[PDB]
From a paper:
Galectin-3 (Gal-3) is a galactose-binding lectin involved in pathologies such as inflammation, fibrosis, heart disease, and tumor progression.
Our approach focused on modifying the lactose anomeric position with aromatic amines, yielding a series of N-aryl-N-lactosylamides. Based on this initial screening, compound 3r was chosen as the most promising early hit, showing the greatest improvement in affinity toward Gal-3C (K d = 41 μM) along with reduced affinity toward Gal-1 (K d = 860 μM), thereby achieving a promising 20-fold selectivity in favor of Gal-3C. Analysis of the binding mode revealed that the lactose scaffold binds in the canonical position in subsites C and D as expected, while the 3-carboxyphenyl moiety resides in a receptor region defined by the backbone of residues Trp-181, Gly-182, Arg-183, and Glu-184. A hydrogen bond between the carboxylate of 3r and the backbone NH of Glu-184 can clearly be detected. Reflecting the crystallographic observations, a charge-assisted hydrogen bond between the carboxylate group of 3r and the backbone NH of Glu-184 was detected in the simulation, likely accounting for its enhanced affinity compared with 3a. Among these, tetrazole 3y was able to match the affinity of 3r toward Gal-3C, while 3z and 3aa again both showed a reduction in potency. Structural analysis of the Gal-3C binding site revealed that the second meta position is favorably oriented toward the backbone of Trp-181 and Gly-182, making it a promising hotspot for modification. The binding pose of 3r from the X-ray structure was used as a reference representing a bound conformation of the N-aryl-N-lactosylamide scaffold in the Gal-3C binding site.
Residue numbers in the entry: 113 to 250
Write the structure that this text describes.
Amino acid sequence: PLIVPYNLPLPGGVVPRMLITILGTVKPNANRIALDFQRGNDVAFHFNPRFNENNRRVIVCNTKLDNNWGREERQSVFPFESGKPFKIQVLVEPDHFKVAVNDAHLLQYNHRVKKLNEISKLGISGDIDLTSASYTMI
Ligand SMILES: CC(=O)N(c1cccc(C(=O)O)c1)[C@@H]1O[C@H](CO)[C@@H](O[C@@H]2O[C@H](CO)[C@H](O)[C@H](O)[C@H]2O)[C@H](O)[C@H]1O
């Protein structure tokens, strides 16, 4: 297994057709999960399942530029479950990140950070046991 928070280098940055696969298990009584695709200090794509935001489960997605969070994009489909194993697949497409969880399409996130070559690492954090994190080309 992998220590969380975990950094996955993305050598040479992201490109369309790159597929990131993450396997893990949500801890009991989880509060949050986060994926942070980073361009230096900036967060090109933040994907943040929140298990209890005012008694609602929601995924928040956003971008952080110069330490400022932008406009949140929120999705109430919520495919994660405390205590249970999951698979996240993030496919880089030309104009968005496309995310599927447990083989079902979840959401798309339009590229705000357009220098995809410079998005050179992925941080994986939160209330999970992390089994594996890797990438391939499709
Ligand atoms: C205005 C306000 O209180 N918040 C906010 C900030 C930026 C964008 C929106 C929006 O589009 O509705 C709202 C809240 O600001 C906090 C602090 O930045 C947010 O929490 C942060 O959210 C980012 C992702 O956006 C990230 O997960 C941070 O880790 C987290 O602290 C909160 O969600 C906003 O409601």
